[PDB]
């Protein structure tokens, strides 16, 4: 068988900053529960 713009650079920079803080909080909460065991 074979098989069968928005031009938003400031929004992109803000996107990336908030995503990075999300990641930092994620691992900051991971180590909180791991390091106590």
């Amino acid at each position: 068988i074979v098989i069968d713009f928005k031009l938003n650079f400031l929004e992109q920079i803000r996107d990336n900053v908030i995503n990075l803080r999300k990641m930092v909080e994620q691992d900051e909460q991971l180590c909180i529960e791991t390091f106590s065991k």
């Binding site: 930092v24 691992d27 900051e28 180590c31 909180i32 390091f35 106590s36």
Partner: peptide, 15 residues
């Protein structure tokens, strides 16, 4: 402090 460890680690290993 377990959250200061993570900031120190994230600035020492930022690059």
């Amino acid at each position: 402090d377990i959250k200061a460890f993570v900031q120190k680690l994230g600035q020492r290993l930022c690059h």
